[PDB]
Design a protein around this ligand. Structure first.
Ligand SMILES: Nc1ncnc2c1ncn2[C@@H]1O[C@H](COP(=O)(O)OP(=O)(O)NP(=O)(O)O)[C@@H](O)[C@H]1O
Ligand SMILES: Nc1ncnc2c1ncn2[C@@H]1O[C@H](COP(=O)(O)OP(=O)(O)NP(=O)(O)O)[C@@H](O)[C@H]1O
Ligand SMILES: [Cl-]
Ligand SMILES: [Mg+2]
Ligand SMILES: [Mg+2]
Lengths: 458, 489, 467
């Protein structure tokens, strides 16, 4: 039934009802508005009144304006039609290509999978990339910390992970812009079009886009991660896929939560963060997990405030991360692509029990020899000079040309399967390609192309 | 009879907050009118009253004073009639040069353009400062934060940027013309008087709109003043043209907005600011944008200012505006008194747009210079504590000190792109490697006067060809090496 | 109209009116008091009641006690008959020389000068203090601010400025003693009678004293700053004369606001201050200015709680100033008086187009050699002096001599130093730091530059230290 607005303070609207009050987390539509204004319920204050957080600007609202209970949380379009489309936190299309014509409507507030549903199997999401799969592999239904700023192929790494996982595993992806810069929302959209991961003319789109832009209120940026998470929950639950969920930025999810908590009048915790910081994180992160149907793996952009790892935001987030992908400018300026720091990037599933025995020992040799090279850079014997030649070739062979960067660069993109990556670096450490030169390993797919490059240039 | 729907009465008044009984039909953020003439924005709509922030001295508001609606649209005048006028937060003239002859008007509070109306930032926005245009390049549509402590040169960067636009606005090419808007929030009047005199002296005011909410003006006028000026810049953006806006500064705007939020009894968070302080600045800054051809092709470029405290860039309000903006120009106190002026930290300053807002002339020498400075900044900590150093590090240490001295620059003299690249080129190809490091700033100032005076045709080649060609390489090589031996004697 | 007191909690007093409710800023006269007790209306609470703050102590006040409304704010004596006399916040004599014989009064609250009234002149005002004149010189008709922590020489400096600038000055002056020591008011008052700046007999007195010291409650300290500048506002506009407006200490205006802010029913802002810090400072500081109609050269002492310049009070004050002299405990601790920070004090007029390039290039050369030395200090304390280059330890030795040549014995500070007072002209200041930069006194020892006037005294003192 229709309830009345009894107070408006910034983006915090109080709504009175008569017959039946809506529960917490329900979406309320405001009547007599030109654009759609959703109010999410937060607190039952008492005396038939509820406190809500507005998902859009509250300018123009009068005391006594009609507010209609939808009878459920924020329900948003889910399906294959979401792929190649941009939607806001409340499900509306913001790419101006008409309504998103799906045959389901999923709620964004959904309980995490039960204990019985949990997959005890420690599986490995084969990304395709050599730097990742060898040294910092992505666990299925896990979370990965994507460190490093922009201008080091961050958006290019995202697009290739969408490209490669859609090919091999047959799993689509989702991008959740939690506090998206509207300029960079434009750039990511059109770069995905030009590469091929988005397709505007036919339905071969490999990503659903969900933007909660920075100029929107705290309510918007708080819940937009849950909206994109629900789009991924369709592909996992209903169609059994191993899904990707890109969240950018996870600190802005924490930040938006800290803003909402403040607006509602809750007393802050240490360092100004909301007292519900661990739960706000936990209720979101526990949905990103493996089930019997499939999985939702998630790459998450980590911003570390004040370069302090012990700050509440990073510390609470690292409880959920199964791995780290550290982008670097020092790696980029030496001509290596992707721009991943091999020693800094690590994984929990990097274990001889979890992944292969041959996987763990060969990758350990690369981690050893790269540090031995970094020791010798400060400065030799037969073993020292042999490692310097191999370690440089290991740094070259870690680089890879991407399918996303074909029109960007010119060179052809190559998806490298798992065991090709194991065998390739193993033969370099064993010393089978000590005869061949160094430049063959620069920008290649598997090690067969490096030998083919050596056979052609001879 | 009493009309409690369209009018009301003041229950309490104090600290620029009037609690008003009645006013049932008022909207959120609606401007109402008090009995004494003063206006007031309805920020808190509560069940038993309206919390109205007062626009001016609140001695004129008493208890039982009749607050009235007037259906007042909150807007400011916009056009080309404001160009060269010093106005207040609501677009009323404070220069005493008659009224504004404005025709169109625009609401102060409007949403930014979404994803679709924009295009990537391609057109460069030239500041004239070498460290900015080369290493921290800004583009039309971009939002570049100027940040640093008190008295680090924050406004100076904005002023030279405005002064740099005279050559484009005097030229015939309508595409390069950039109109300017300076916005003063919380400053004193004699500072703004000096600032408009500075711009008039450089003949900059004929294209510059000055919006000024000073310290004596009430908090709501400081709160609105950036938004008012933003609407002025949007008209140029929408109607084909390009615009530049300076918010000086958002730190003082946040304090004004905090005052209102605390006295309206909204919950105080970190540093006593409200939960919507990020929502405040992100609303403002996102309205700066690069438009595509369909909606116009125009642009609005934001240069917000943030005063840090003891270099704490992690403070709440600096943390907000850093993450919102497309890039940052970090100014530091230690660099300023070291002789690095403008005192821009190269290592920490960043432009996420980058090369896309540069010409090929600048793009050639900038990438090479940026790399060599990175090689220096690692090694520079043991520059003095070395002595017995190998030739590899001695090359980086020598070259790096030379290049740092080329980033130094005088105030109120913004340079053309062809003049900058010539000076950087001398450093990159290493003609100044044996010159004494202390005499580079003086060397450059005379060298600049010489190449402008005599070799005016040479600067024409660099601007036409879009690079330093093999002909210019050899021609410039002779001019440096002879001037170098003559100067150091 | 008549009202009644309804509450008294410290300096904050609530008053209820049956019929005529008085507006904000109006002075209310409390009846049944031996001495005069003003209450300024700060807020309107509702229910025919107003909240006020007391200009004197509230002890003795009873609920239901009668209060009359003046129908105007606090109106005080203005005109040349104020000269030589000591006023308090409400415009009464505290010097015991009869009433202030004038028939014209001005309200302490008033709108600040408009933007069109602003001037842009800024010629140098040479103090005779080396560090100030060299690095961050003051301007005539300009706003000057003396920052510093507790006990680093703000008052000793401001009195020396009165000694050097105010005595050789044709126009009038105003010393606003806001919330500091009554002892220092006594010291100044009788020192000016000695020098003939105040004259008890004839009407030739240049300075008009105004005092509301730390013995007074917050209402006095919150408004006596305004009282003092309203005297200077008359001498600016109505006369048309160069006024010197000394204030000591203008932090106390903001501090007095923070003391009552809790009891006015306000949520506190950062570091315990009132939300209305910058706006309250703004409507006060914008009045302290030079306009078309008259020139004010305003020197203001600014206290810095816990020696933290980031503190909301001093942090907000910076922007209101054309020249800033920041003092440090770290520098005073080493005996370097005046303890000015050479890498923190600044001015608007420090420009080669205003003070000439020869001045400017020496001032930056002094700041560079000191700033380069500041980084070294911490490195060479551990790793030792002998690791430095010969170029570095040249700049270390020169820096340490330059630090000492920035020190200066004041005349007002003769009782602390034990050295005779010295005034150094701007010409000999620039030449002194020129020669030390060039290395013309590298042979001379370190301590010869410490606590001397011109560069010549260093050469003479260097020969004295030989035996
Ligand atoms: N490139 C430069 N070369 C020489 N002097 C400069 C330069 N840039 C700034 N200055 C001087 O440095 C001082 C401070 O510059 P300003 O632009 O006022 O910085 P600010 O941080 O905006 N000041 P404030 O707003 O008071 O904190 C002025 O006296 C300028 O003359
Ligand atoms: N120039 C100076 N020469 C010699 N001694 C000085 C000088 N300045 C300060 N002192 C010494 O330090 C004391 C403190 O000076 P004073 O000017 O009272 O500091 P202040 O900053 O005004 N303190 P406060 O007002 O309490 O914050 C003086 O009384 C002297 O003993
Ligand atoms: Cl000079
Ligand atoms: Mg400034
Ligand atoms: Mg003192």
């Amino acid at each position: 039934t229709t309830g009345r607005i009894v107070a408006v303070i910034g983006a915090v609207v109080d709504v009175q009802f008569d017959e039946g009050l809506p529960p917490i987390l329900n979406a309320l539509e405001v009547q007599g508005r030109e654009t759609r204004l959703v109010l999410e319920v937060a607190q039952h204050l008492g005396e038939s009144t509820v406190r809500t957080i507005a998902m859009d600007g509250t300018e123009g609202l009068v005391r006594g304006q009609k507010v209609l209970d939808s009878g459920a949380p924020i329900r948003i379009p889910v399906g294959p039609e979401t792929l190649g489309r941009i939607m806001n936190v409340i499900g509306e299309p913001i790419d101006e290509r008409g309504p998103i014509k799906t045959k389901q409507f999923a709620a964004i507030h959904a309980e995490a999978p039960e204990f019985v549903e949990m997959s005890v199997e420690q599986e490995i999401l084969v990304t395709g990339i050599k730097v990742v799969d060898l040294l910092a592999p992505y666990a299925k239904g896990g979370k990965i910390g994507l460190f490093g700023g922009a201008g080091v192929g961050k958006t290019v790494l995202i697009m290739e992970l969408i490209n490669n996982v859609a090919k091999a595993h047959g799993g689509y992806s989702v991008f959740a812009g939690v506090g998206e810069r509207t300029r960079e929302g434009n750039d990511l959209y059109h770069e995905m079009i030009e590469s091929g991961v988005i397709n505007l003319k036919d339905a071969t789109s490999k990503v659903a886009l969900v933007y909660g832009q920075m100029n929107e209120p705290p309510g918007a940026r708080a819940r937009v991660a849950l909206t994109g998470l629900t789009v991924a929950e369709y592909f996992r639950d209903q169609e059994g896929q191993d899904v990707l969920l890109f969240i950018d930025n996870i600190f802005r999810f924490t930040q938006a939560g800290s803003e909402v908590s403040a607006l509602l009048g809750r007393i802050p915790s240490a360092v100004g963060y909301q007292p519900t910081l661990a739960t706000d994180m936990g209720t979101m992160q526990e949905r990103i997990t493996t089930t019997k149907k499939g999985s939702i793996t998630s790459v998450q952009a980590i911003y570390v405030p004040a370069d302090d790892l012990t700050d509440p935001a990073p510390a609470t987030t690292f409880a959920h991360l199964d791995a780290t992908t550290v982008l670097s400018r020092a790696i980029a300026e030496l001509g290596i692509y992707p721009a991943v720091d091999p020693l800094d990037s690590t994984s929990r599933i990097m274990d001889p029990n979890i992944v292969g025995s041959e996987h763990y020992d060969v990758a350990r040799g690369v981690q050893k020899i790269l540090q031995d090279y970094k020791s010798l850079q400060d400065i030799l014997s037969e073993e020292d000079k042999l490692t310097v030649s191999r370690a440089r070739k290991i740094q070259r062979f870690l680089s890879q040309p991407f399918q996303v960067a074909e029109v960007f660069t010119g060179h052809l993109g190559k998806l490298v399967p798992l065991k090709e990556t194991i065998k390739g670096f193993q033969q370099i450490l064993a010393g089978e390609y000590d005869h061949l030169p160094e430049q063959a390993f620069y920008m290649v797919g598997p090690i067969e192309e490096a030998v083919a490059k050596a056979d052609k240039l001879a | 009879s009493v009309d409690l729907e369209e009018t009301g009465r003041v229950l309490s008044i104090g600290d620029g907050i009037a609690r008003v009984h009645g006013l049932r039909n008022v909207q959120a953020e609606e401007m109402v009118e008090f009995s004494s003439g003063l206006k007031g924005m309805s920020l808190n709509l509560e069940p038993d009253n309206v919390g109205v922030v007062v626009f001016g001295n609140d001695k004129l508001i008493k208890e039982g004073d009749i607050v009235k609606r007037t259906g007042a649209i909150v807007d400011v005048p916009v056009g080309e009639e404001l160009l060269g006028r010093v106005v207040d937060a609501l677009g009323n003239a404070i220069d005493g040069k008659g009224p504004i002859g404005s025709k169109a008007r625009r609401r102060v509070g409007l949403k930014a353009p979404g994803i679709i109306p924009r295009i990537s930032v391609r057109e460069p926005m030239q500041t004239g400062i070498k460290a900015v245009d080369s290493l921290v390049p800004i583009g039309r549509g971009q939002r570049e934060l100027i940040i640093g402590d008190r008295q680090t040169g924050k406004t100076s960067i904005a002023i030279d940027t405005i002064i740099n636009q005279k050559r484009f606005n005097d030229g015939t090419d309508e595409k390069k013309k950039l109109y300017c808007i300076y916005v003063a929030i919380g400053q004193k009047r004699s500072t703004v008087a000096q600032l408009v005199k500075r711009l008039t002296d450089a003949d900059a005011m004929k294209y510059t709109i000055v919006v000024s909410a000073t310290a004596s003006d009430a908090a709501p006028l400081q709160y609105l003043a950036p938004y008012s000026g933003c609407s002025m810049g949007e008209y140029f953006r929408d109607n084909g043209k390009h615009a530049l806006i300076i918010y000086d500064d958002l730190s003082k705007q946040a304090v004004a907005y905090r005052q209102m939020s605390l006295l309206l009894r909204r919950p105080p968070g970190r540093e006593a600011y409200p939960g919507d302080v990020f929502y405040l600045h992100s609303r403002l800054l996102e309205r700066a944008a690069k438009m595509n051809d369909a909606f116009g092709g125009g642009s609005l470029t934001a240069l917000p200012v943030i005063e840090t405290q003891a270099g704490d860039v992690s403070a709440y309000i600096p943390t907000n505006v850093i993450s919102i903006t497309d890039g940052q120009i970090f100014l530091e106190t230690e660099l300023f008194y070291k002789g690095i002026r403008p005192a821009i930290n190269v290592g920490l300053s960043v432009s996420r747009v980058g090369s896309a807002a540069q010409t090929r002339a600048m793009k050639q020498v900038a990438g090479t210079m940026k790399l060599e400075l990175a090689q220096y900044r690692e090694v520079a900590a043991f520059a003095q504590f070395g002595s017995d150093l190998d030739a590899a590090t001695q090359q980086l240490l020598s070259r790096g000190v030379r290049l740092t001295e080329l980033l130094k620059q005088g105030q109120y003299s913004p340079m053309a792109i062809e003049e900058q690249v010539a000076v950087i080129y001398a450093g990159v190809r290493g003609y100044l490697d044996k010159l004494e490091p202390s005499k580079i700033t003086k060397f450059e100032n005379a060298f600049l006067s010489h190449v402008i005076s005599q070799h005016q045709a040479l600067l024409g080649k660099i601007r036409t060809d879009g690079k330093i060609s093999e002909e210019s390489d050899a021609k410039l090589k002779e001019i440096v090496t002879n001037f170098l031996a003559g100067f150091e004697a």
